[PDB]
Structure formats: C-alpha cells, structure tokens
Amino acid sequence: RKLNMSILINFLDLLDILIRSPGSIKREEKLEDLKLLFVHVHHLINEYRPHQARETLRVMMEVQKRQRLETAERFQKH
C-alpha cells in the first residue's frame, strides 16, 4: 500500500517537474525514481508466488482428503 501511494505521489511530483522546470536534472532521477518503485511493486508480489504455490498444494490435499471420504461414504451407503 505504501508503494502504491508512493507511485502516485511521485507521478504527481513528476507533473510538478513538468510544470516548473522541465530542464532540471531531477526529472531524469524522477524518470528513474518511479521505475525503482515499480520494480519493488513487482518484486513484492513475486514473493507471493512461492506462498501461493505452497498454498495450492494445501488446498489440493484438503480436497483430496474430502473426496476420498465422500467416495467411502457413498460406497458404504450402496
């Protein structure tokens, strides 16, 4: 959430660069700056990718277990 808000505020400050002094050095920094921010917003959510991976194994196992018991109960009724 911090990096989302930082991306938007640095876009507004880049608009302030384009309003006040377009020939400044800072815009090059600014056109680098939010790039670094965008990298981090990808780099955090890639860190959800192992977790998601591990978590899908967990729910698969739960569904696996449930289906076994369901067939057992189905068969026993028969």
């Binding site: 006040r20 377009p22 920094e29 921010l37």
Partner: protein, 75 residues
C-alpha cells in the same frame, strides 16, 4: 509516514515556457510596432532576369584606368 522517495521540487518559478518570453526579453515594443521595402525604397528610386542574377549572386554568397579605357562615341 513519509512516502518512499519523496524529494524537493525545484524553485517555485524559474525560467519556464509559461512566462511571457517576449516581454521578459524586452521585445514587446517592436512587436507592437509590427503587428514593401521595394516600395519604401521606390520612395527614393524609380521601380523595384539580371536582377534574378542579382538575387542568385546573393544566394551564391583602377577607377581612373576604367575612365581612361571607357572610350566610346556619342552618336
């Protein structure tokens, strides 16, 4: 608290393109004047081929002896 990678914006109004550049550059009265010199020079002379050759030389870029060697008759 502070957002990531905040910095200082430049000086409040430095030289921009949003100013009136002409009035800052002292060129206002010339424009207020301005807003043929063939005709303005034909105020002095008669009118305004080889003049095409004059413009082409423009696009390209012993006096007593001449008066002595200028022998030609009248009629």
């Amino acid at each position: 608290g502070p957002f990531y990678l905040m910095r200082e914006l430049p000086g409040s109004t430095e030289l921009t393109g949003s100013t009136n550049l002409i009035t800052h550059y002292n060129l206002e009265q010339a424009y207020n004047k301005f807003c043929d010199l063939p005709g303005m020079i034909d105020l002095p002379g008669s009118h305004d081929l080889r003049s095409l050759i004059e413009k082409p030389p423009i696009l390209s870029s012993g006096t007593m002896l001449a008066g002595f060697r200028l022998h030609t008759g009248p009629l």
